Amino acid sequence: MKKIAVFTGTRAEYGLLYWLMRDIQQDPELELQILATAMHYSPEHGETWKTIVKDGFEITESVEMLLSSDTSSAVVKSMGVGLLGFADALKRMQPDVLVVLGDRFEALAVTQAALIMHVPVAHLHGGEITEGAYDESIRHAITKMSNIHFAAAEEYKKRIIQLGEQPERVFNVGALGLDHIQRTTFKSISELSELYDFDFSKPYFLITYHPETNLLEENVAPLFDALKQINDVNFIFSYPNADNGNTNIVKAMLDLKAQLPDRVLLVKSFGIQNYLSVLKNALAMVGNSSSGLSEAPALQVPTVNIGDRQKGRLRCESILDVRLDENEIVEALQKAINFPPLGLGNTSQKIIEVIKTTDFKKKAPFYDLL
Amino acid sequence: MKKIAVFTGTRAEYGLLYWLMRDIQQDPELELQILATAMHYSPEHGETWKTIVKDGFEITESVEMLLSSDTSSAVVKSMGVGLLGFADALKRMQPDVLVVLGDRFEALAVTQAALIMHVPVAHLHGGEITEGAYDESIRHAITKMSNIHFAAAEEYKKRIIQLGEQPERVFNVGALGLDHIQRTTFKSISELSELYDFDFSKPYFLITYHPETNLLEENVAPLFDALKQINDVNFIFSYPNADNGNTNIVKAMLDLKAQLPDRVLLVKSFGIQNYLSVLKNALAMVGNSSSGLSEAPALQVPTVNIGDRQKGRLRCESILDVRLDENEIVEALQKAINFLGNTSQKIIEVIKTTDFKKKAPFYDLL
Amino acid sequence: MKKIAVFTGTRAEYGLLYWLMRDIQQDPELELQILATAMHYSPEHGETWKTIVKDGFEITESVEMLLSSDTSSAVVKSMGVGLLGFADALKRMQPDVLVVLGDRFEALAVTQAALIMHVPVAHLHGGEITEGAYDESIRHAITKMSNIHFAAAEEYKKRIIQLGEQPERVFNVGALGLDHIQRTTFKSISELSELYDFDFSKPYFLITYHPETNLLEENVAPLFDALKQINDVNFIFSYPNADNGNTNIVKAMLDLKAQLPDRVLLVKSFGIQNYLSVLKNALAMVGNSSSGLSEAPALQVPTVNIGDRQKGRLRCESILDVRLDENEIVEALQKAINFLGNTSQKIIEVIKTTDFKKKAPFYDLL
Amino acid sequence: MKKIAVFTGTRAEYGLLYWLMRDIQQDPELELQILATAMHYSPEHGETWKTIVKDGFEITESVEMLLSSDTSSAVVKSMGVGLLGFADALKRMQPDVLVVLGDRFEALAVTQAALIMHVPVAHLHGGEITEGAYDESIRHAITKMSNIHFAAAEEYKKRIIQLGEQPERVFNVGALGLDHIQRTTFKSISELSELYDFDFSKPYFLITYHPETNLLEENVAPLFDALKQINDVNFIFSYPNADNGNTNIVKAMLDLKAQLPDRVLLVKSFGIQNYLSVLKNALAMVGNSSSGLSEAPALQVPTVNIGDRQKGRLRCESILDVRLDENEIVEALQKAINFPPLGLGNTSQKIIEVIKTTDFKKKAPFYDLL
Numbered sequence A, D: 001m002k003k004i005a006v007f008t009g010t011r012a013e014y015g016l017l018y019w020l021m022r023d024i025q026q027d028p029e030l031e032l033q034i035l036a037t038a039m040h041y042s043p044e045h046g047e048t049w050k051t052i053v054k055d056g057f058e059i060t061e062s063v064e065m066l067l068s069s070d071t072s073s074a075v076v077k078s079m080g081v082g083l084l085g086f087a088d089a090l091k092r093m094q095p096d097v098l099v100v101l102g103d104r105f106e107a108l109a110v111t112q113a114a115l116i117m118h119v120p121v122a123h124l125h126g127g128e129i130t131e132g133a134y135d136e137s138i139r140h141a142i143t144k145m146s147n148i149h150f151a152a153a154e155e156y157k158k159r160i161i162q163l164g165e166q167p168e169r170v171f172n173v174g175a176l177g178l179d180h181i182q183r184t185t186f187k188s189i190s191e192l193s194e195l196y197d198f199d200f201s202k203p204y205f206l207i208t209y210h211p212e213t214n215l216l217e218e219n220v221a222p223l224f225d226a227l228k229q230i231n232d233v234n235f236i237f238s239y240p241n242a243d244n245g246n247t248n249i250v251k252a253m254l255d256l257k258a259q260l261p262d263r264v265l266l267v268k269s270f271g272i273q274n275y276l277s278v279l280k281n282a283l284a285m286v287g288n289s290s291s292g293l294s295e296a297p298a299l300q301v302p303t304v305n306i307g308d309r310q311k312g313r314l315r316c317e318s319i320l321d322v323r324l325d326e327n328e329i330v331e332a333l334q335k336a337i338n339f340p341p342l343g344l345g346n347t348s349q350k351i352i353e354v355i356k357t358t359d360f361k362k363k364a365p366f367y368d369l370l
Numbered sequence B, C: 001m002k003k004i005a006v007f008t009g010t011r012a013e014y015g016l017l018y019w020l021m022r023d024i025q026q027d028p029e030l031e032l033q034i035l036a037t038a039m040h041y042s043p044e045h046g047e048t049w050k051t052i053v054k055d056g057f058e059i060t061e062s063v064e065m066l067l068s069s070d071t072s073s074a075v076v077k078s079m080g081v082g083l084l085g086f087a088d089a090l091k092r093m094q095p096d097v098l099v100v101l102g103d104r105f106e107a108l109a110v111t112q113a114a115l116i117m118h119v120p121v122a123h124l125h126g127g128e129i130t131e132g133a134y135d136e137s138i139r140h141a142i143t144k145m146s147n148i149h150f151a152a153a154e155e156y157k158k159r160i161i162q163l164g165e166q167p168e169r170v171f172n173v174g175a176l177g178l179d180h181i182q183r184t185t186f187k188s189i190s191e192l193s194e195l196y197d198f199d200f201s202k203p204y205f206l207i208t209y210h211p212e213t214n215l216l217e218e219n220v221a222p223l224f225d226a227l228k229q230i231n232d233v234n235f236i237f238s239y240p241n242a243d244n245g246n247t248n249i250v251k252a253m254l255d256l257k258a259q260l261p262d263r264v265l266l267v268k269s270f271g272i273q274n275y276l277s278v279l280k281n282a283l284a285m286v287g288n289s290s291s292g293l294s295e296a297p298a299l300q301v302p303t304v305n306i307g308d309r310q311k312g313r314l315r316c317e318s319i320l321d322v323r324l325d326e327n328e329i330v331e332a333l334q335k336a337i338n339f340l341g342n343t344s345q346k347i348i349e350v351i352k353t354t355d356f357k358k359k360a361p362f363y364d365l366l
């Protein structure tokens, strides 16, 4: 009975890890532990740890750590509190394996805590290329302190190889989140249209434009005016998150809903099942969400990628890359109406297979390229 | 006038950094800051911040962080305390750059603290390999969180470039500590003998064994049982570092000193000037310290390197690699009985000539 | 020149401390230090350190400490972070005396920090009773860890003395905040309606309800239901403090605002110049704030005190004490609708003329 | 099934709490929890938590917290780490009652943490008066944040009452440690004499001189010189603690035994059973230990109390108080060869009875003496 502890710090990342947690919980050979921390205990986001409990899981250890502040100094302090909690948490849990996904600073903290305390780390989504002040550097740092690696694609795996990891410790298992695509029973057009009292049979664009944190120059107009110049198609939207530019986007939306209440639908939180059901019958996922570069291509729905929020990500034919001016965009919406590396969506079982069949208690020797 | 903050957590790496700090202090165009932490403030390690103060330096910020408990969890908690201190300390120094040397856990904490607070990192001694310690993965992680890199060898520069760093941000400047070999005055036999009240005239070994942190269970007895079998040779010890597993080594040391008080000298921290003076006159550098892979060959003194804490670093014919095994260690000890220096200015130059306030993009290999 | 560090964690007690801080700043024989922390650096409480800076004060040391999680365990952790910051902040200010006012948990953290580090403490507003909050036991613990005490009334001085404090170390100097009533210029209703874009020309309750921390389960619905039942009256709010249980109050405030948007004004932080101006022209001070037991009766403004958070403090004639009950809050609201300045000088004189570096022995009642 | 969590931070304090811990563990109505922290995880003192486990107890929660430093700043930091660990520790234990003894700063930290988290505190040894930089202030602060109080004597109980505690929340139950006296089966002189290869039939003084911390470096001769002046009498010693100035004492001892290799006995650690067995047949407990003001009087063995280390405690007929003057000492030893408030030693059972029969979930209203 191997103890596999899954680390989770945010609602979205937990949504990525959901099916792996479910599979471990279902498997009688593997005991699932959970270490929930960071934004799961922020009132800002509604204490999303309760969601973990409502989906049927038991939080083994909880570490509140986030300071109530927007300074970087307070992020360092939050990381210190995180380390102090993770010391006793891992001390009590004694996991056989710790699962860490992504590149957030709390994941770096728990990764180094596991390194010092000899808890082998399985890192998910290593070797990728993103944007930000430091998210990528942190991602590679987490890679170097992890014992086994589950990359979402072959080039990510090979960049992990270049990072010094031995090839027998890196596995291309696809993107874990896409398991939802494989395991969702989708809602029909009828069901979506009666649950939201809005007709989905008429063609619709689905959009999630999240605030570009560094792009302070967030003129919101260049796209939605471009949605007024394209007719015949409805606009269904869900709401952005909590960054710097949240309101200036949200009202850009709501006035293009006040202007045409008979072409626009506003959904606060979709839920992964209804979200994928809405995206499934779309002519385009447009915006800068990561769903545009994974879930939309896996559903054979084209995506028109606006801005550089998703720069560095694997591109595919369904991706149509554009900026935030009006011209170049509409050719891309039409270019959606006129017509994969990340895998199919069985990532959880591949990960479990590797964990059951591979010894990785020790960090393998550094791998030098000839 | 740019603010060059230098991080130091042990007497060791402080001695490695001495000439960079002194040359930055000397340069009127650069303002030296100092962030001293960790072993510099533990009395079980000598309270070596006093040495920093005695050498004319001003400690800008001090951060006490080491928990006394000798466990890995207490190391992690020590790192958390460190982070909590570095948040304010860095918040206040507002350095133009942070210089970090090495691969220890406090260096990891301060490096991620600087990265999150957008303070560029100049990392020294990256691209090296020490498989037996978790300092290995820590070292590569610090490399990935650093903006500019100063390697001590071409092999290490190559490994740093392989880690995805842009080659225009990696420089081969040699070992900063070896500058001492040219710039620091050494002490004679009688000076050491008088200030340490120990007869350095009789042949001795210089011994420094730190816990090999990737060892599941670490029984250091084969080393000490080894040294007893050598006759007519004295034993001079430096204390192990603050990594978890060091109190066992300390106990074995006080045991050996308790048995042979006329032949064993226990020094918590030497002086690095005094340490290089003692090392030069030693029959051998014995243990698993990095000084056996750099300072000892540069002073033409053999190395009895024990275990895997140094596995991966460059070798030379004066390096006797043995396992923590009594027979191998004694054989290597008897075998040990019977048989261009401008790094600081290169680094300072590169720091004044190069813009590295942003992490360059990941460098894929063609 | 003697160093007087003043501790401040909320905009409230900063306002109460203003004239002491300013008069220390004006005395050339006293150097003013400031240790600001807690709610001053949380965006959910207005980031009220900017008010400290705008009033011409220099923040000698800032320590962010508040965790965003709204639990009692997160409050404990916040006290831990506070301690870890106060260690270095006090290590560096090296103050001759630390002035702490009140009974909040951050005041407990800093008071024990100064006690351990041998910084004598001048405690303000000890000897008072607020049974409904854990600030009660906190306050008396701060009293027993303080070297000199400045009470607000004779009964409070008496209770401080019963706590074992030497009578020669306890002074009834009055309430420092009430110095504002004598020394601060108030704002007119025209200006108050200008800067907040809200017509103060119309009758309004000023409401401030903090979490009663000794309540097992706290539902603030009766207060808001009672406020809804009042017609032709506006509702102006300040936000609850950082004590655990405040985000439910915030939720109820945003709910009442989304229900009655034209009659509800939500202000995270006023200016205390602005807050005393708003309280002066308010119909009633509604809630459980301590201003209802001091500033509001001083300004001849009736107060509807709810619950036991203020239970024990001296009661004026204009004090309507109701339970967290819809009926009595309605009754007190309608009934409300239907009808000196030298403390800073005294405290400064005592601090300048009295030795209190060492805690006097326990005073047994003879 | 009440959950009673006993807090412990030092080996000696655990030795005081031992019999209450034993009684709670044996009592089927009460679940015993243990929160071990502070000096139990200091290598300086040998990791005394192992002692707790070896005596048969289970450590429910452990919090490493002590910084490796002699500064007061590092004590404040250690207190912060303590708070951060106690938050999650109490979060997990959810004790019905937390028992806190003494006046150490870690006990103040856990007491205020319990206060914030609504864990009722039973405080032991409140209302006493000692000499220290701040230990008494901390003791009274712990009293003010505790819900029920178990004083060692009537005057302590009454000072707790003066501190504002309601009389129905303060109970004089005697000194907990003296329960050892009631429950020890003593070693005979024979057994002691072969166990230590030293003859106990010859009259012997028992001495524990601890370095008076405020008496930074002590002139120890005024005492030892007074012990060479007494002949026909042996001198048995145990070793002092680990403070600032002990070593010149340990060599003052080792040198007044190296002079008389056949009249002095030096024991590093006695153990409570052998210690009380030695003290029972002693001529006097002389020195400045706390055993001189509790265990020695309870065994009807006179005490020669030197210095001000025990200033403030209850004195009794058995106590003969003496400065560190050599003459003034010698008359006191003679008068020791010439010829209680803290109770008999059933404190644990009285405490347990009170806990079983009293509700103290809430802090009682402040008690004003009219």
Ligand SMILES: O=c1ccn([C@@H]2O[C@H](COP(=O)(O)OP(=O)(O)O)[C@@H](O)[C@H]2O)c(=O)[nH]1
Pocket (backbone or CB within 6 Å): B011, B012, B013, B015, B016, B177, B208, B210, B238, B239, B241, B267, B268, B269, B270, B271, B272, B275, B276, B288, B289, B290, B291
């Ligand atoms: O008690 C000591 C122990 C070591 N060092 C220094 O440590 C350096 C290298 O040895 P160390 O083992 O500390 O470094 P590491 O092996 O961890 O890299 C040398 O320059 C010494 O000057 C010292 O000065 N005093």
